[PDB]
């Protein structure tokens, strides 16, 4: 199909952007802004905790993952309340889960406050992961355009 463009992505993510059905596996403090191994270690800890909680009758919270130029919003499915919100410039890393096509996570937070959010997607995680890649790419693209913009101004 048609290759993506900056303009297509700006239209896709502006305003309310897009959203996906998911469940929150958990949230973990992590030492670094980025890293595959760190992210997977955190995913495995949180999945272990979720399995323990599930053996005691608990359930993962049902959520919407909302992706827009405003960043990521975690929204409670039942109430519609925004539980968590991170702007684009406070999300540092997107992790795939090599054990689970229906899981992914992201590291977010300012310095010294890195946290891994582990998400169990209702469908395949990949489209959501690709949306995050595209979101970051188009914001980066636009900013570098308006930088080359100003180096030519003088």
């Amino acid at each position: 199909g048609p290759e993506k463009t900056d303009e297509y992505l700006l239209a896709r993510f502006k305003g309310d952007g897009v959203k996906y059905k998911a469940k929150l596996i958990g949230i973990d403090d992590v030492p670094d802004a980025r890293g595959d191994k760190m992210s997977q270690d955190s995913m495995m800890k949180l999945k272990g905790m979720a399995a323990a909680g599930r053996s005691q009758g608990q359930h993962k919270q049902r959520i919407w993952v909302n992706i827009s130029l405003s960043g990521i919003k975690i929204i409670d499915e039942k109430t519609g309340v925004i539980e968590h919100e991170h702007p684009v410039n406070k999300i540092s890393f997107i992790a795939r889960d090599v054990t689970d096509n229906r899981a992914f996570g992201y590291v977010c937070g300012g310095e010294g406050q890195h946290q891994f959010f582990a998400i169990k997607t209702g469908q395949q995680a990949e489209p959501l992961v690709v949306d995050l890649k595209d979101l970051f790419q188009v914001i980066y693209n636009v900013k570098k355009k308006e930088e080359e913009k100003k180096k030519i101004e003088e």
């Binding site: 802004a33 980025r34 890293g35 595959d36 992210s39 684009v88 410039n89 406070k90 999300i91 540092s92 890393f93 997107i94 992790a95 795939r96 090599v98 300012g110 310095e111 890649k133 970051f136 914001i139 980066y140 900013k143």
Partner: peptide
């Protein structure tokens, strides 16, 4: 298999 956000600002 993950990727960085080039727009990340820690401070």
């Amino acid at each position: 298999n993950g990727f960085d956000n080039p727009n990340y600002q820690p401070q």
